[PDB]
Design a protein around this ligand. Structure first.
Ligand code: HEM
Ligand code: HEM
Ligand code: HEM
Ligand code: HEM
Lengths: 141, 146, 146, 141
């Protein structure tokens, strides 16, 4: 599952991404909006535009929820609940879309964080987010 | 493909800044570490059990050169992306039977690695173009499941 | 495609035993029930909240006829499976932006429904041939993500 | 998640499939082996042949583990553990392969069980097996 030591590569890779989590969670919306245009469908009320203050304002939100997960990770179920009813009850996001933000998020740790982004850590971050999206998709299953 | 004159170029211009022989394999390395089932297919290969013993498999470093190999034949033959690859797809598909979405994990991680190495200059309109080649190289090797 | 003379026929011969107008929609019905996000795209449509109110949407029964519609244009035009569909893919892809794997859920459930209705005569070599058309009709509508 | 009432459509759809679970779990290997030829890769030691006694003998096994899950469903983690180390540690099955047996299994409830296989139940069986494969794939994530 998410083992003793994956829960350490993430407590730590996020450790150092700090004061920035918000510029990062918005650099990764930008990247998902640009590369997989098919996700634009949901932010019809966003300037999915590049300086856009809405996407900048939402990075802060995706990044605030990533962190509550990094903290509370031995129990995502509980903490991420209302983002797992909103995403799955109120908005109906096709779950293949979590795979892809999941990936732009990592193309972002990657591009802002090179020495801490070792291969073992590239696996734990990935294991971490494959778990955020399983929680995010569960009123589903 | 399509690549718009202007995608074509952010792409063509990261690539020869690209140290193939040692990217080819930070990528195959990272694929057997992040996505393990892929290991099933490289037991012709060595100790693949702790991450350090892969990324330094002279054998995982070697096959990976073959493979930045054919992104190269693609990164520019983007015109049949479909025929540069008939033989390998014959190879990957009805020979080893790799399921086609292990084709996307690989171009996908290849991008994590294009990004890890060029940092800030893998702007996003510049990644966006690589998800296109990649999704292209992957629709190509998979063309015999039909 | 390919369909071997002998697949071609188990397929062609279940189909005209097929009550289109009421299969077309046990299928679209079942897709918005089993796979809900798909609902996002049919709000032009009615109460879709408890399973009974879908399977009896004269509106979900109607669109589904259109759609056994084009499996029909395919089940036999298997030769470009690619060109019978240019317009719909233009339609489904760069118009509604359905992600391409909702294309496989649909042919997939269509098979659960071909099976639900013909029981024992949907032997397995006879399903095996439908996973092929289907995976075919789905590689076709998706052909503009390239 | 797997709610009060999905856990009832499965306790019941399996209720009636009984004395047969074994002819069924083997009709569904046959179907996955035939339609998605790419899974043959793992049963090189099987006559993935049609009367084959090995595939008939394994239906019994896939069907024995489906049932311990149907019973113990409020806690799959625990019961399915050693099938979730074998599948993921010892054998390395690409997890896209659970999606597909998952589907042949349902093309099978479907073809042997028409009146109980209503649309609401077609959803619960699917929700049930999307959970067996999440458990089956977890040393993974
Ligand atoms: C890492 C995975 C994700 C996390 C952690 C996450 C988190 C969040 C949070 C915290 C909010 C707002 C919370 C609140 O206001 O109460 C939100 C809103 C939203 N998310 Fe996500 N999200 C994720 C993935 C996705 C994906 C893949 C999509 C694809 C459509 C998506 C679409 C949306 C939309 C449309 C909104 C509402 C936007 C608005 O109307 O303001 N999210 N998300
Ligand atoms: C961009 C995607 C990929 C490309 C371009 C690619 C390319 C290649 C090439 C060029 C070879 C050697 C061909 C030769 O020397 O003649 C090869 C071999 C191989 N590849 Fe791929 N590959 C890709 C993805 C994958 C994936 C996802 C897997 C799954 C594990 C895989 C498994 C293998 C294996 C096992 C071999 C050994 C060759 C053999 O023993 O016949 N490859 N690949
Ligand atoms: C075999 C796969 C599919 C086929 C053959 C198909 C076929 C069609 C056809 C023929 C139409 C109407 C075209 C016309 O009347 O001119 C249509 C409309 C539509 N389909 Fe698909 N479809 C498929 C899969 C899907 C999927 C997976 C979705 C996802 C929800 C979807 C969503 C829609 C929507 C929303 C419309 C409304 C048309 C519009 O408002 O423009 N379809 N489809
Ligand atoms: C519903 C999901 C599945 C369940 C419940 C399941 C269950 C089982 C069980 C109980 C065993 C033997 C248990 C034992 O001997 O201790 C087994 C063996 C095996 N399973 Fe699965 N399985 C599932 C899906 C799959 C899939 C998708 C594959 C694809 C390769 C697979 C491949 C195998 C293989 C290769 C063996 C060992 C065969 C042998 O060497 O004898 N299983 N499975």
């Amino acid at each position: 599952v998410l083992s003793p030591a994956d829960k350490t590569n993430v407590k730590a890779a996020w450790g150092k991404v700090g004061a920035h989590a918000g510029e990062y969670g918005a650099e990764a919306l930008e990247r998902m909006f640009l590369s997989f245009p098919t996700t634009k469908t949901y932010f019809p009320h966003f300037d999915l535009s590049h300086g856009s203050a809405q996407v900048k304002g939402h990075g802060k939100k995706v990044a605030d929820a990533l962190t509550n997960a990094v903290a509370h990770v031995d129990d995502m179920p509980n903490a991420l609940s209302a983002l797992s009813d909103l995403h799955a009850h109120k908005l109906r996001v096709d779950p293949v879309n979590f795979k892809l933000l999941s990936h732009c998020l990592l193309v972002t740790l990657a591009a802002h964080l090179p020495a801490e982004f070792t291969p073992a850590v590239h696996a734990s971050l990935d294991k971490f987010l494959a778990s955020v999206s399983t929680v995010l998709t569960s009123k589903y299953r | 493909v399509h690549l718009t004159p202007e995608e074509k170029s952010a792409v063509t211009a990261l690539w020869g800044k690209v140290n193939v022989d040692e990217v080819g394999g930070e990528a195959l390395g990272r694929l057997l570490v992040v996505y393990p089932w892929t290991q099933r297919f490289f037991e012709s290969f060595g100790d693949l059990s702790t991450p350090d013993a892969v990324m330094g498999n002279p054998k995982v470093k070697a096959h990976g050169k073959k493979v930045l190999g054919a992104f190269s034949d693609g990164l520019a033959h983007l015109d049949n992306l479909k025929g540069t690859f008939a033989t390998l797809s014959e190879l990957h598909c009805d020979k080893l039977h790799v399921d086609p979405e292990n084709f996307r994990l690989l171009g996908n991680v290849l991008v994590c690695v294009l990004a890890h190495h060029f940092g800030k200059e893998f702007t996003p309109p510049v990644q966006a173009a690589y998800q296109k080649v990649v999704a292209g190289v992957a629709n190509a090797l998979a063309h015999k499941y039909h």
